[PDB]
Amino acid sequence: ALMKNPQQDSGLLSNSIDFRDQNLIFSNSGGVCTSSKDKIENYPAKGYPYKRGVKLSFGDGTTELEVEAGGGDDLYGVCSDIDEFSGMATVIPITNNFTGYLTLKKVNPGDKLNFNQHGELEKVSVNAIALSKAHKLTEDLFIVLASVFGNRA
Amino acid sequence: ASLLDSNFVPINFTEFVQAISNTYKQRRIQFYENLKRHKR
Amino acid sequence: VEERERIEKQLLLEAERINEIDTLAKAHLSNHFNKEVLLAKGYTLKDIMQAQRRELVRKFVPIEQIKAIAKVSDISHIDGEILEQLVSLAKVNIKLR
Amino acid sequence: LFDENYYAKAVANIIGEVKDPIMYKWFSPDQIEDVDLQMGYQKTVKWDAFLNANPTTIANEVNTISTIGFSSEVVRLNYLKLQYKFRHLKQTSEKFYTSDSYIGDINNNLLPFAQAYKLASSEIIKLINHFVLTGTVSIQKDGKNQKRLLPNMYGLLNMPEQIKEEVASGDKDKMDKIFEKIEAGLSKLELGDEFSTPMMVIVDPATSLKLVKPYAAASSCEKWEDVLIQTIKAINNREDVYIETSNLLKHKILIYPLNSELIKFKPSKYMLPTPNEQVDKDSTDVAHSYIDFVLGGLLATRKTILQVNIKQS
């Protein structure tokens, strides 16, 4: 449904002849431009926060802290990858900038974007700038190339 | 000084890079040698 | 003409020895020491054979036997009947291996 | 090196599996000559003469004579060095991901270094081919968001000061109208001294299908392709005419000679993809590698390439 790797199998072999517009898929993990000096952290995942803004959530105290999809004043980072077997979400701190495709709330380059309560980007605090128009992968799934530069009023 | 030669042994990365370029050149030479364009 | 006949006998003997050495060396040491590439690098046939023999000793015969039986650690200059003993010991080692 | 570095050994054993670029079919063997330069430029100088006015009649005494002028032209070819990065699996961790019929984490889309490098190289070669033909670098199928390149970097399709013909939208399917524009462009071609040379035509698949139709009441033993070859043979001194089809082109026809004197390709000796020595390593099993490639090196004389665009509505 929303997982990075579709569970439904593919009926036919793909045609690997073209080389254009073959990166706008939801399985595309990480960032478009990645530096070797980036800080990345894994955390226990509450729900499925993949390609969404994450916030720190605390339980009673018996178990450690986890990350859940969220934004606003509670935003802590951006989830760029997830491992389903271990339920670990790779989170880039807000103190580190990031450039990649992120979930957009269901928009032209240069628009100012901030994270909502569900960890989805929306048009305007300013946190990131849209680098392209919305790309639709499903009736409700919209991704967008964005570059996040931390927090600034 | 090409990767196509089995006896070639690169001492360092720079010689390895040169062998890559030489191998590319020999391949394009070989391609044109074997190429036969269809007339008409 | 029988003198040349016996010369040809010895030629066949050393050719068979060379063939056996090459066949075992190809499957044991490496392809880098193949006769073709060594000849391209510019080594005579006897030099190729003795280098292959020394590599065979350096692979099968342990170093202690080299510095005791052959009296020197470096097989670089031991060639001769001592090299024959070393390659015989290498044959024994590969037989038991 | 091979003993000390595994990745160098891996690429050497796998470089032979990469297919040759398709650009080689578009150029004669002599038209391509490599240069030793990663980034920078190369310059050349040409000398021209021209007439200023009508000749002066030598009658009686006169001191004012008409002049013949000269002009210098300096031509610069730019080169650029570009790099890509791809993730893969560390060599020591391959055994823990080996499976019955494959090696690599399907769930996390990871591969061994060898397979990752081969796939990466193939994609870059496709990008290089696209640039040489069309003169632009872009990943969108639309063609926007192009990478800003240095000047004096041109391909066959975007070369300035060349003959350009446009077929009207209403005549998109009328082969006679298309052939009419080609003939008009062929007349405007200026080969001059270098005319007894082979010629090359590159067309889109839709155009190629229109060519194989019989020439038009329909004719016999005469296709539109045969007529076109004869027309080109008229102006190239009855030399060889080659026709190729490229899926990269779209409603475009490209005609140019195969003579090194008019058009020459001088690519860098490091234009094709080459591994980088830097490998990112960490405590995990995920590693990164870099591939370098060089763009640029196409040179052509002005008014020697015919570019026909069939406007589609």
Structure tokens that stand for D99 in this block: 């499976």
- Roughly how many angstroms between the first and final C-alpha of chain C, as a whole number? 45
Q: How far is CA A145 from CA A25, A93, A135, D85, D143, in A?
A: 12, 18, 9, 19, 17
> What is the dihedral sign for C-alpha C34, C40, C43, C46?
positive
Of chain A residues 32-61, which have a CB less than 8 A from chain D? Answer: 34, 36
Collect all residues of chain B within an 8 Å Cβ-Cβ radius of residue D5. 13
Report how far residue A105's alpha carbon sits from residue A28's, in angstroms, rounded to the nearest whole number. Answer: 19
> What are the residues facing A99 on neighbouring strands?
A147
Task: Mark yes or no for CB contact B21/D240 under 8 Å.
Answer: no
Any B CB within 8 A of D279 CB? no
Chains B and C touch (3+ CB pairs under 8 A): yes
What are the helix and strand counts (H, E) for chain D? 5, 11
Of the candidates D97, D87, D112, D107, the residue with the CA atom closest to the CA atom of residue D287: D87
Report how far residue D9's alpha carbon sits from residue D114's, in angstroms, rounded to the nearest whole number. Answer: 10
Task: Mark yes or no for CB contact B40/D226 under 8 Å.
Answer: yes
CB D14 within 8 A of CB B20: no
Say whether D8 sits in a helix, a strand or coil.
helix
CB A33 within 8 A of CB A92: no
Say whether B28 sits in a helix, a strand or coil.
helix
CB pairs under 8 A between B and D: 53
CB D213 within 8 A of CB D175: yes
Of the candidates D126, D120, D118, the residue with the CA atom closest to the CA atom of residue D17: D118
Collect all residues of chain D within an 8 Å Cβ-Cβ radius of residue B37. 25, 240, 242
Rounded (10°) CA dihedral C10, C12, C18, C21: -100
Report how far residue C72's alpha carbon sits from residue D147's, in angstroms, rounded to the nearest whole number. Answer: 66
**Phi–psi pair at D65, nearest 5 degrees:** -120, 150
Say whether D126 sits in a helix, a strand or coil.
helix
Question: Residue B13: exposed, middle, or buried by beta-carbon count in 10 A (0-12, 13-18, 19+)?
Answer: middle
Collect all residues of chain A within an 8 Å Cβ-Cβ radius of residue D145. 132
Closest CA of chain D from B1, distance in Å? 13
Q: Length of chain C, please? A: 97
Report how far residue B32's alpha carbon sits from residue B39's, in angstroms, rounded to the nearest whole number. Answer: 16
Q: Length of chain B, please? A: 40
| List of residues 6+ apart from B6 with CB closer than 8 A | C31, C34, C37
List, comma-separated, the residues after which chain B is broken, a break being a C to N distance over 2.5 A; otherwise answer none.
none
**Phi–psi pair at D50, nearest 5 degrees:** -155, 165
Residue appearing with tokens 């080692």: C93
Structure tokens that stand for D181 in this block: 């524009």
| List of residues 6+ apart from A48 with CB closer than 8 A | A2, A3, A69, A82
Question: Residue A18: exposed, middle, or buried by beta-carbon count in 10 A (0-12, 13-18, 19+)?
Answer: exposed
| List of residues 6+ apart from D269 with CB closer than 8 A | B21, B25, D34, D35, D36
B interface residues, D as partner, C-beta within 8 Å: 3-4, 9-13, 15-17, 19-21, 23-25, 27-29, 31-32, 35, 37-40
Task: Mark yes or no for CB contact D1/B32 under 8 Å.
Answer: no
Say whether D33 sits in a helix, a strand or coil.
coil
Largest separation between any pair of C-alpha atoms in chain B? 50
Any B CB within 8 A of D269 CB? yes
> What is the dihedral sign for C-alpha D207, D213, D219, D222?
positive
Of the candidates D147, D129, D151, the residue with the CA atom closest to the CA atom of residue D138: D147
Report how far residue D280's alpha carbon sits from residue A48's, in angstroms, rounded to the nearest whole number. Answer: 29
> What are the residues facing D70 on neighbouring strands?
D49
Report how far residue D58's alpha carbon sits from residue D290's, in angstroms, rounded to the nearest whole number. Answer: 72
Structure tokens that stand for D25 in this block: 């079919």
Q: Length of chain A, please? A: 153
Report how far residue C97's alpha carbon sits from residue C86's, in angstroms, rounded to the nearest whole number. Answer: 16
Closest residue to D141, CB basis, from A17, A21, A30:
A21
Largest separation between any pair of C-alpha atoms in chain A? 54
> What are the residues facing A102 on neighbouring strands?
A144
Structure tokens that stand for C67 in this block: 């510095």
Resolution of the coordinates, Å: 9.8
Report how far residue B13's alpha carbon sits from residue D147's, in angstroms, rounded to the nearest whole number. Answer: 30
Task: Mark yes or no for CB contact B6/C37 under 8 Å.
Answer: yes
Experimental method: cryo-EM
Of chain B residues 1-20, which have a CB less than 8 A from chain C? Answer: 6-7, 9
Q: How far does Cα D136 stand from its chain's mean position?
A: 10
Of the candidates C95, C12, C81, the residue with the CA atom closest to the CA atom of residue C53: C81
